[PDB]
Amino acid sequence: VHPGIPALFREPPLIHDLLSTETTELQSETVNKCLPLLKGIHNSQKGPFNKYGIPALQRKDHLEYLYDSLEDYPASFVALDASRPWMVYWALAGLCLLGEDVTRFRERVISTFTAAQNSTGGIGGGHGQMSHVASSYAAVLSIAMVGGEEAFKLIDRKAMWKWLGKLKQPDGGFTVCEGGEEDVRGAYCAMVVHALLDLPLALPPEAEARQNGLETFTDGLPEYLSRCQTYEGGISGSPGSEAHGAYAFCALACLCLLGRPEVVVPRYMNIATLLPWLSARQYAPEGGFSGRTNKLVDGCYSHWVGNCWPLVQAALDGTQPLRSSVGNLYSREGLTRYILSCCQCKLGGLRDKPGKHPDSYHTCYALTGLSTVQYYHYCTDSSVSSFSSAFSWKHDPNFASDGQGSDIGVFTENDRLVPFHPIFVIPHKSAEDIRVWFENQSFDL
Amino acid sequence: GKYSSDPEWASIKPIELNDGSDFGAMPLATISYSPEYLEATSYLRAVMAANEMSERALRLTGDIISMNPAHYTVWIYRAKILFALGKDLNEEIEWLNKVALKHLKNYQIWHHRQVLMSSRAHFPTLPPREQDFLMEMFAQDAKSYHVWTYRHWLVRHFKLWDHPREIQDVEALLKADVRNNSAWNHRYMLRFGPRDENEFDAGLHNTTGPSSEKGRLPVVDEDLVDSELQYSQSRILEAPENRSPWSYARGVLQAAGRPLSEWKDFARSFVAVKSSHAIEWLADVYAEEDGSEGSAAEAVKMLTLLKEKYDPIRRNYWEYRIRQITASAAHATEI
Ligand SMILES: CC(C)=CCC/C(C)=C/CC/C(C)=C/COP(=O)(O)OP(=O)(O)O
Ligand SMILES: [K+]
Ligand SMILES: [Zn+2]
Question: Residue B88 is part of a domain; what is its CATH number?
C-alpha cells in the first residue's frame, strides 16, 4: 500500500457499537467496498497514482462516456422521457468541466429544446409534456453553456415569466409545475431561471399569488426557506421533512440569489446548527459526503453538499473587496480520495459508490464536486449585473499541494477541471454572458 | 395499433411526436420509444390539447403509467380527470397502492396520493388502513424520503400529532433500527413541531424570531420534555455512537430553552471513549454555558480528541471551533 495514504483512509472508525442494525450492515458493507479502492490496490483501478496514492482522473474515458450519453437510447430507457433536458445538461456540464468547447452543440441544443418549449410558457421534458421548473433550469443552463444569440433567442421570456408566476404559492415557495409538488428544489430552479433570464421581479399582474398579498417572485421566499430548516441544522425539501444535503444546497443557493451571503444566510438560517450538520455529512475512511444522517456516502453529494461550503464560507467571511478567511471547513483531501479512488468506473463515467454502474447524473456531479475542491470561490463587491451579489462570484485556483496538512489539494494539476459558479452550476462566463445579454434586451410586449 | 384500431378512440386524431428530428439539426439524448408508447402518448397529446375529461382518457393515463410511471404530466392530468368526473377516490387509492408497491422509489405516486387525500369531501377523516399501508412501505424501505414526506403531510392534514399510531409506528421503526434518522425526524414533528393551523407550516417554532432562537417553544410542557429526554438517553445507551438521538436531544433542549449542561454528567459517562457525540456535547457545554476558569481549555481538549482520534475527517470544523473558543476566551480575559 502506497505510503502517501494516511491511516484515516485505510481503516474503519475507532468507535464501534456492539448493536447491529440494517443501518450498520449497509454502512459496514460500504466501508468494505471502499477500502481496497482507497488503498489503491483494486484490480479495476487505472493509474498513474500520484504522490498521495490516488489515481489520475481518467479524462479520456469520461469524455467518451459523456459524448456517448448524448446519443440515442433504446426503448428500455423510456422512464427517462421526462428527464431528457437533464440528460442534456448533465452531459454538457461534465464536458465543460473536462475542458471541452461545447459551442459545437448549439444547433443540436436549439433543436432539442424548441420542441420542448410550450406556447403558454416554460420548458417541459419534451413535446407534449407540461412545463416543469427542473426541465426549464436544465434547458436554461444548457443554453448558457453553448451560448450564442440564436440559442438565447429560443426562449419566450414573457411566457416564461407568466408561467413561473403561476407556480408562486401563498407560503412564499414554488410548485415545480402546475398541480405539482412544492419543495425547495422548485424554489431554487425557479429563481435560477428567473435570474439568468433577467425576468421582472414583479409577479405578473394576474398571478394568483397576488390574491394572497404577494407582489414579487421573492416575497415570502426567504421566510419559506427558513421554515425548511430542521432541528438537526440542515434543510429539508419541505417544512418538517428530514434535513438533506440536496435541499440544503437548493435553499442556500436560493438565499444567495436574494442578497449577500453574509446578510441573508445568518438572517434566515441558524448557522450554529447548520454548520455542524454540514460538517457531519463527511465520513472516514470513505472521504465522501452522505445526504442525511445515518445514510451512506454518494458521489453526487460531492456537489450537493460540497458546494454548500463556498456559500456557507462566504456567509462567514463576508464579501471580498477588489480579508482573512475561515478557509475550508471540510476535508478536501477526503472528498478528492472518494471521487478519484472510489467513484471512477474503469470503462468511463463516475458513480454513486463502488458496486453501482455509472450514470451521467453521477458523472456530472462527482466532477462538479472535484472542481469545487480545486478553487477558492468567493463573492465580491464587483458584479457583472447592471441578484447583484450572485453575479459577483469570482475564483482563484487552489493549487495542488505537497506534504501533509489539514487542508490540502491531493488531486494533481493534470486533474484540474474548469471552475463552476457555486450558485448556477455552470462556468462563470456562461452565467455572466446569458445574464448580461438578457439585461440588454427589452422585455417583450 | 391498439388505440388507432379501437372504435372507442375513433372520434379523436392523435398528435404525432415532434422531437426536432426532421426540421433542423439532430436532437440530443433521444430515446427510441416502443411503438406502444409512441401511440399512447400521441393520443395523450390529443386529449390534453382538447382538455378532455373522459373515461377513455382516464384509462389512457392508466396505460401510460403502466409503461412509464415517471411521466409527471400524465399523473397531473389523471388527477384532473378524477376530480372532473367525480370518480370514486377510495377505488383510486386502492389502485394507487398497487402502483406504489411496484415502484418503491417513485415519488410522483406520492404527490398524487397527497393531491387525492387532501380532498375533504372524499376523505373527511383518516382512512382506517392508511397508516398500515405506510407501514407496508416502510417495511420495504424504512427511510423512504417521499413516504416520510407524505406522512408528515398526513399528520398535519388530519391533525394526528397526538394520535397513538404515529408515535407507535415511530417506536416500532426505532426498535427495528434505532439509527433510523427518518423516524427520529418524524418524532420531532409529533412532539415539538408547530401545530398552529393559522400559520404556514414550519419544521421549527419561532421562525419569526432571531435565527439563533429558531425552534424555541412559546409554551413548554416540562413533563413532556423530561420524558422525551429520558427516552433519548435510553436509546443512546443501546448504541452510543448513533448520532440520531443525540441530535434529537439537542433539538429538544433548544425547543425547551434548556441548556446542554442538563446532560453534562450523562455525556461524561461515555468518557476510553464510547461516543464521539458525547465528546462534542462536552465541548459545547464547556465552551458555551460554563463561564468558569479553565472551561475553555477543557473545550479545546475535547475538540482536540475529536480532530486527532474520534472524528478526524472533520478536523477543519473542530479547528474552527477551537479558534472561536480561543477568541472568545481572549475577549473574556481582556474585559
Ligand atoms: C436542483 C435540484 C433538482 C436539486 C435536487 C437534487 C436531489 C438529488 C433531490 C432529491 C433529494 C432526496 C429526496 C433524495 C433521497 O433519495 P435517496 O433515499 O435515494 O438517497 P439518500 O439515501 O442519499 O438520501
Ligand atoms: K428534478
Ligand atoms: Zn447520488
Answer: 1.25.40.120
